[PDB]
Amino acid sequence: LQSLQTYVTQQLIRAAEIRASANLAATKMSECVLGQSKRVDFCGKGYHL
Amino acid sequence: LQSLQTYVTQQLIRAAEIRASANLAATKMSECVLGQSKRVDFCGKGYHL
Amino acid sequence: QKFNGLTVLPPLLTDEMIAQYTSALLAGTITSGWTFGAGAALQIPFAMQMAYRFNGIGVTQNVLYENQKLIANQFNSAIGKIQDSLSSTASALGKLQD
Amino acid sequence: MAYRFNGIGVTQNVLYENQKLIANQFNSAIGKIQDSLSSTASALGKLQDVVNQNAQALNTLVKQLSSNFGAISSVLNDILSRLDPPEAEVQIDRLITGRLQSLQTYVTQQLIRAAEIRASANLAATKMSECVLGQSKRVDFCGKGYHLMSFPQSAPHGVVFLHVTYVPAQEKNFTTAPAICHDGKAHFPREGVFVSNGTHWFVTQRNFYEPQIITTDNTFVSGNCDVVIGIVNNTVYDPLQPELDS
Amino acid sequence: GTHWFVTQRNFYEPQIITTDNTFVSGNCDVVIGIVNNTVYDPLQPELDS
Amino acid sequence: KKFLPFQQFGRDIADTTDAVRDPQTLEILDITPCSFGGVSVITPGTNTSNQVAVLYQDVNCTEVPVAIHADQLTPTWRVYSTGSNVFQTRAGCLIGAEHVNNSYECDIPIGAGICASYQTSQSIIAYTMSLGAENSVAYSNNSIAIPTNFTISVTTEILPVSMTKTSVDCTMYICGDSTECSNLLLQYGSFCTQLNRALTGIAVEQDKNTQEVFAQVKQIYKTPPIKDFGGFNFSQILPDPSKPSKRSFIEDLLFNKVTLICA
Amino acid sequence: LQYGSFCTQLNRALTGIAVEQDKNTQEVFAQVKQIYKTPPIKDFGGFNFS
């Protein structure tokens, strides 16, 4: 049971990190792919095209 | 004590998630409500007014 | 559940205070556009504010000053539709309920 | 700085005419920032809070070694000396369970704090990319007001961004119209707004009062005068006639 | 089918192509797909003076 | 609530008794926990004052005198348990703070819109926080406010970027150079390796955070020896070669202002 | 009592979570320094905000 608790806690933390990464990816898709972003270094290095 | 520790850990994880949500809400209040945002799909679908 | 040391009601800001904050934000945005969010609140007619925001999206002012009544009707209808959709849908508030 | 003023919808001429005032204001603001940091010990609350949280977590972890956890003693050597193997094993097992639970709790708390710090560092990197390496149009992201620029400063386990922003200071009231009617044609400002005191009508940039005569170059024509609500009669000066006649 | 106009990109508001609606950049032996049309000068009707 | 003839007990959603019928008379009596709650101390810093107020959470001001009292240090604790300056709020009972009809910006958040401030002789005053200064924009459909001047405002935003990279040896921490303890711990599997891996990952994450935040430039740019930027002065933010550490005045101030971990 | 300060850590974590909730609410909603009020007559060029 302690092993399961530790594994599930680690999985929850990793899932939170992956959720943050996926939110960033969705934001990039919305702003970088569906449009032109003026945010510097957001959609690549340089003046985003 | 194990039950209480599990509850507190779950509460901490949920609090982190809700803090991320609140940061997103504060950013949306700052950018969409107090101004006009050029970010695509951030302040709704379409050209934000 | 207040039977084993669970004491839960420390909201710092009452719902009335949060509603007041939202009303202040609404008044500021309506009567001053985005100016109040970056310094002194500067008044401007709402039609001219809408023209400014149309210019923000790359559309000239004249379109709003020529279709103002149509745009206002569309906005009012959209707001009414949002109210009706919220009233008629129970899963709209799924996140807070969850 | 002129181009960064252009970024916030303000022409270059205002900066090129008030360069001395702007430089004095910037220097005074920097000095005030230094003075506020020096005289206020709570300015760096976030970094100190992080340091204190880590220190207290470590301190509690180390103090947990002094807890019996139901054993006869909290010292391994004392248990070994005072007891035989058959029961020393169970006492050591109790101590091991307690200490392992404490270590697991500490590691979980450290993981959560590390996730929070990673989020904070991602935000700091985004601000550096958008606020320091460029001018951000996002409202209230790089400080309060119309963002002009930013400067990074290192701090123990943290970064301090000095956001320099443009804030309107002295507002004045004027009468405004959405369009102007000159010859049966509606005129709308090319980039600005129509303002007017009691007598005359001018066209001025939105973020700074710089009244100018409403000429054909300052405005563009679109439709007649019977569609716009609030259109006001006025004359739109056309430079062509005085130059061509002479 | 017949005429050429210049319009804002987000709303069909056709307008006569004139020297103030457009800017010149070199001769048109390089641009691919360039078409031929009249670019009226607003000063032309004032040539009577 | 009305029990059925055969019903004796009553339980809530949490399966805890909250109602019982009196054996003598057929009447139903509810059961609730009486006090619970906690005691918090509201105080301005030891500097500028020593008097304090006491907040008893989720309790009525009538029950405070018997809430763990009658055995406390009488002379100095009865003053904060009874007497005047007793205020009932949604948070609980406040003792030693004078309720004030005015409203100021929150200083010490009590809760439910109630805050406390030491300002007035002087005494702790509890009030309802004011969301801000009331304002009314002179809105008209043909009036506009245009700025006739401006201000250059510099503001600080402080963001933590890393933690101390701490590694704890699980075997040593649990077992101090004890062969028997280490052998017993070996029976628990790989927990120590998991904890060590987590800590190492945290340290690597701190290093990565620092690199991403600060390593955003490939070249190392340098300011000109002659600093004539049109009147703008960056001495407070540019590095100072005079000091042994080539760091700006503000950077040195920040480093000094932040303050044994090896103990 | 023999188990150390686990109760203390749990209480501190819960208090920090509560303070975090308050901070989140303040950050989201307390973004306006003044309390603006709409004019008594709601004439906004045909736009209705009732």
mmCIF file of N, CA and C in Angstrom, chain F residues 2 5 27 29 42 53 56 65 76 81 95 97 104 116 128 130 161 172 174-175 177 180 212 237 240 247-248 262-263:
data_model
loop_
_atom_site.group_PDB
_atom_site.id
_atom_site.type_symbol
_atom_site.label_atom_id
_atom_site.label_comp_id
_atom_site.label_asym_id
_atom_site.label_seq_id
_atom_site.Cartn_x
_atom_site.Cartn_y
_atom_site.Cartn_z
ATOM 1 N N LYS F 2 -38.964 14.389 12.629
ATOM 2 C CA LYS F 2 -39.901 13.435 13.214
ATOM 3 C C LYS F 2 -39.436 12.022 12.880
ATOM 4 N N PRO F 5 -42.037 5.478 14.382
ATOM 5 C CA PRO F 5 -42.244 4.850 15.700
ATOM 6 C C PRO F 5 -41.143 3.877 16.095
ATOM 7 N N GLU F 27 -39.616 12.003 22.221
ATOM 8 C CA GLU F 27 -39.145 13.253 21.643
ATOM 9 C C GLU F 27 -37.730 13.055 21.120
ATOM 10 N N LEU F 29 -33.992 14.543 20.084
ATOM 11 C CA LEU F 29 -33.006 15.555 20.432
ATOM 12 C C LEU F 29 -31.823 15.441 19.483
ATOM 13 N N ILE F 42 -4.048 38.006 16.860
ATOM 14 C CA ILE F 42 -3.848 39.139 15.968
ATOM 15 C C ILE F 42 -2.998 40.164 16.701
ATOM 16 N N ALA F 53 -4.956 41.009 20.165
ATOM 17 C CA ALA F 53 -6.338 40.565 20.160
ATOM 18 C C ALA F 53 -6.375 39.066 19.899
ATOM 19 N N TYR F 56 -11.267 33.603 18.285
ATOM 20 C CA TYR F 56 -11.721 32.232 18.482
ATOM 21 C C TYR F 56 -12.634 31.887 17.311
ATOM 22 N N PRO F 65 -15.654 32.413 27.389
ATOM 23 C CA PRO F 65 -15.071 32.401 28.742
ATOM 24 C C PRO F 65 -14.798 31.005 29.271
ATOM 25 N N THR F 76 -3.518 37.905 33.336
ATOM 26 C CA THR F 76 -3.223 38.372 31.992
ATOM 27 C C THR F 76 -4.027 37.661 30.913
ATOM 28 N N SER F 81 -10.096 37.041 27.521
ATOM 29 C CA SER F 81 -11.166 36.055 27.483
ATOM 30 C C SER F 81 -12.542 36.639 27.759
ATOM 31 N N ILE F 95 -11.734 39.279 20.615
ATOM 32 C CA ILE F 95 -11.585 39.869 21.938
ATOM 33 C C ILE F 95 -10.363 40.775 21.923
ATOM 34 N N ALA F 97 -10.245 43.749 20.374
ATOM 35 C CA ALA F 97 -10.289 44.629 19.215
ATOM 36 C C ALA F 97 -11.604 45.392 19.223
ATOM 37 N N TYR F 104 -11.403 50.846 6.149
ATOM 38 C CA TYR F 104 -10.074 51.158 5.645
ATOM 39 C C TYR F 104 -9.549 49.966 4.857
ATOM 40 N N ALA F 116 -8.238 43.897 10.692
ATOM 41 C CA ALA F 116 -7.822 44.553 11.923
ATOM 42 C C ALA F 116 -6.603 45.424 11.661
ATOM 43 N N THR F 128 -14.530 46.705 8.543
ATOM 44 C CA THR F 128 -14.837 46.058 7.275
ATOM 45 C C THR F 128 -13.953 46.670 6.193
ATOM 46 N N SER F 130 -12.376 48.150 2.907
ATOM 47 C CA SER F 130 -12.888 48.934 1.791
ATOM 48 C C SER F 130 -12.192 48.474 0.517
ATOM 49 N N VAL F 161 13.503 31.692 -8.907
ATOM 50 C CA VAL F 161 13.922 30.911 -10.067
ATOM 51 C C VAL F 161 14.484 29.547 -9.705
ATOM 52 N N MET F 172 21.762 6.510 4.959
ATOM 53 C CA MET F 172 22.378 7.157 6.114
ATOM 54 C C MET F 172 21.335 7.831 6.995
ATOM 55 N N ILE F 174 18.082 7.194 7.402
ATOM 56 C CA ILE F 174 17.304 6.207 8.145
ATOM 57 C C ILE F 174 18.203 5.429 9.098
ATOM 58 N N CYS F 175 19.385 5.035 8.630
ATOM 59 C CA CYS F 175 20.313 4.212 9.399
ATOM 60 C C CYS F 175 21.664 4.915 9.456
ATOM 61 N N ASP F 177 25.243 4.604 9.976
ATOM 62 C CA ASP F 177 26.365 3.671 10.013
ATOM 63 C C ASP F 177 26.042 2.428 10.836
ATOM 64 N N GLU F 180 23.110 -3.488 11.002
ATOM 65 C CA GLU F 180 21.836 -4.165 11.220
ATOM 66 C C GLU F 180 20.681 -3.346 10.660
ATOM 67 N N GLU F 212 17.438 28.297 -18.290
ATOM 68 C CA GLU F 212 16.406 28.867 -19.151
ATOM 69 C C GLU F 212 16.169 30.336 -18.832
ATOM 70 N N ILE F 237 21.902 50.029 -12.551
ATOM 71 C CA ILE F 237 21.634 48.689 -13.057
ATOM 72 C C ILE F 237 22.813 48.087 -13.806
ATOM 73 N N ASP F 240 29.210 47.371 -11.675
ATOM 74 C CA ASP F 240 30.172 48.328 -11.151
ATOM 75 C C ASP F 240 31.546 47.676 -11.096
ATOM 76 N N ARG F 247 28.947 43.568 -10.159
ATOM 77 C CA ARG F 247 27.494 43.567 -10.107
ATOM 78 C C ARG F 247 26.991 44.976 -9.826
ATOM 79 N N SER F 248 25.805 45.280 -10.351
ATOM 80 C CA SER F 248 25.252 46.625 -10.267
ATOM 81 C C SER F 248 24.903 46.995 -8.831
ATOM 82 N N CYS F 262 24.218 24.628 5.972
ATOM 83 C CA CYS F 262 25.156 23.531 6.175
ATOM 84 C C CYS F 262 25.173 23.034 7.614
ATOM 85 N N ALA F 263 24.520 23.740 8.540
ATOM 86 C CA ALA F 263 24.495 23.304 9.930
ATOM 87 C C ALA F 263 23.793 21.964 10.102
#
